[PDB]
């Protein structure tokens, strides 16, 4: 990252890259430990689009760098359409956020970027990292995730909370969908255990807290 | 590595932690994972490597079955490079046994610590192209006829295999592009073959063809 | 053609049209004999787009004048995207090449085209003629053409250079594919016979000329 | 060809090319009719190696121009090993015969070759034309061609002189093999009919003319 009297760009150490690879390989790219570590890296530095490529290339499988680059390209193609419709329109084109082109293809040209382009490339890079799949799997639809027999209830809810995180982009639309689907796809035991509790949050609680509290020793 | 303080050049062996990190990286992730490539480039470009140190680094990091392949492709690379040092004007004075580190003039560390940079860069390029050909610890290099996206397999896991095969076999990158962009459609399953076919041969703006190809048949897991 | 001794449109002779239909019907529209015959008419005359209408209609099957008109129309849609996007932009629109419209729909209007336009229509009709299929077949894919057992080797490579000419437009990209696929799709018997000769062209030779040398007696 | 009335390169006529393709397609590239027709063009003109490019491309199958270019290239690699190893050495390198390179890659450079070079290219293209296969077959071995039962005898010997012309280059070595194999690979019925006539040619005759005399009525 770059350090603010002029712009000086220094690569990462070996320890940071070793920790990132050892995290991604063992726990997954979207385990909560990796999200916490990645947000601590990104919010605590000044990342140019060179550094997202250096970080993601040296940490991900080659089957996952393709997905990272693809959803980065999709995110900047949608962010450009909201950038020209401004009043005044901002001078943030596609080739300034992708880190390629004629005027933006070397680290000396990129190190003189403003705060708004930094905070705009950060959100689309994080949303790109949020969509990277696990090595052997594909993202399923909501018709497939059902609590099978002999399976705990929070293990069932924590699959829905991830499926609704890869697909749907708005959090308010995530909450209503997972609150609805937590009752329809449940086992008959947890459905009968959860039916007298529906639509009743007592005080300062989440709905799914009382839901997982309700059916508790049911499966096993 | 070796270092130069000027009128003389001194030698020092590798660290005790560096070889440990290299062995853990090669054993757990692979010899040609993208992490080990940047680690090896950071070691090579930031130091001065004589072929003695290349043999020490490759001996203490690879399998007993992988040092054979590294030595074989090192020998083949020097055999192909010598034929471009005698067909030059002026003829470049780098024979076979200056690159391989053998012989009578080039068999000790004090004999090898006096090399010039036009041979250091050559042995660096040959050693890196040799390391790019070492296989995984149980497999042989397949041909392009066999890499096919089977049913119930995601799409980018197939393009990753195609790019690995094209990196191991073909030595020209401009030819590496135009073969994998064609084979990425002829070897897909019928569902991605139906999904790519509307968008075939059209780039919108400033992207790679695979970036729209993986975007097209995204959720093929039903 | 049109002759300038200042314009004079002369029709085709009865003997020239008799030899084109007799040649197309017996050898094919893309035999090497018809390729040199068609160039001696094109490069030796002044063909307006009204004359490619008469020459192709009176020489091709009714199922092949449909394919010749398709890839003619599709070829102008890419020529205008290299006509206006150049500096300076040239006045070559769509309906000047296709020979339709209001200003380009008679002999007396098309008889005064310039040599920038005559040379551009002549290079896209000849690219349309390279895609006209045989009278009963469709263009196969690259992974389908394999050397069958008890089939001679130069008959296999002759098929390989035909699939790689209807599909790929760049002649450099043909060169890297038809040499690569010549060993991989081959027979098991030649694959043990080409492999010692692989990738070592000695002096003043082609790659495949050294390959057909090695399977000189592979028929049983 | 080139005419000297001091150089003038004239292209081929439209009627000469029409008869070569009509002849090759119907009878074969190595019928006795095409052998005398090709010699009347070669021995009656001045063919530069640019003209063997046009004549063979506009007359052969695409699978047969690959074989014509292979044995042309292979034939120059043996001519240079009889060019420099003679006393005195002649200035006939590889890229003068093949018509490639920098000094031999246009019409105006090749129009001034000498009659030592014109006569040497003319004897190796004509040897390349003797090896071009039929449009669906490969060259069989000598122990495969046997006279089948209920097959006429001169049709068997006509096959024997065709295998012994693509394989063996020395015309004296053809003579001792096609006469020896004419009795050994023959039918049981002619083998009892040729054996009293064996090895006794009376006066002013060929060996096989006395052999086809003896199987005049062997068809059943």
Numbering used by the authors:
A (entry chain H): 1 to 4, 21 to 236
B (entry chain G): 1 to 6, 21 to 236
C (entry chain I), D (entry chain I): 1 to 5, 22 to 236
From the article:
CA forms the capsid shell surrounding the viral core that protects and transports the viral genome and also interacts with host cell factors that are necessary for trafficking, nuclear entry and proviral integration. Further, we assemble particles from HML2 CArec in vitro and use single-particle cryogenic electron microscopy (cryo-EM) to determine the high-resolution structures of four different types of Fullerene shell assemblies. Our studies of HML2 CArec show that an ERV retains the ability to form capsid assemblies using the same architecture as exogenous viruses. Analysis of the shell structures reveals the intra- and inter-molecular interactions that drives CA assembly into pentamers and hexamers and their association into shells that encapsidate the retroviral genome.
The D5 particle is an elongated or capsular expansion of the T = 1 particle with polar regions identical to T = 1, but containing five equatorially inserted distorted hexamers, consistent with local two-fold (dihedral) symmetry. Moreover, adaptation of hexamers to the local environment is also a feature of our other D5 and D6 capsular assemblies, where hexamers interact with each other in the equatorial belt. Again, the pentamer conformation remains invariant and the hexamer six-fold symmetry is broken by NTD domain movements, changes in the NTD–CTD linker conformation and in the intra-hexamer CTD–NTD hydrogen bonding configuration and in the CTD radial position when interacting with either a neighbouring pentamer or hexamer. In the D5 and D6 particles, further configurations are possible depending on whether pentamers and hexamers are located at poles or are equatorial and interact either longitudinally or laterally. Nevertheless, all hexamer–pentamer interfaces still fall into group 2 and all hexamer–hexamer interfaces still fall into group 3, albeit in D6, the α8 displacement for the equatorial hexamer–hexamer interactions are larger than in D5, due to the lower curvature of the equatorial region. Exceptions were the N-terminal β-hairpin that contains a large loop insertion and is more mobile than in the crystal structure, and the NTD–CTD linker region of D5 and D6 equatorial hexamers that displayed weaker density.
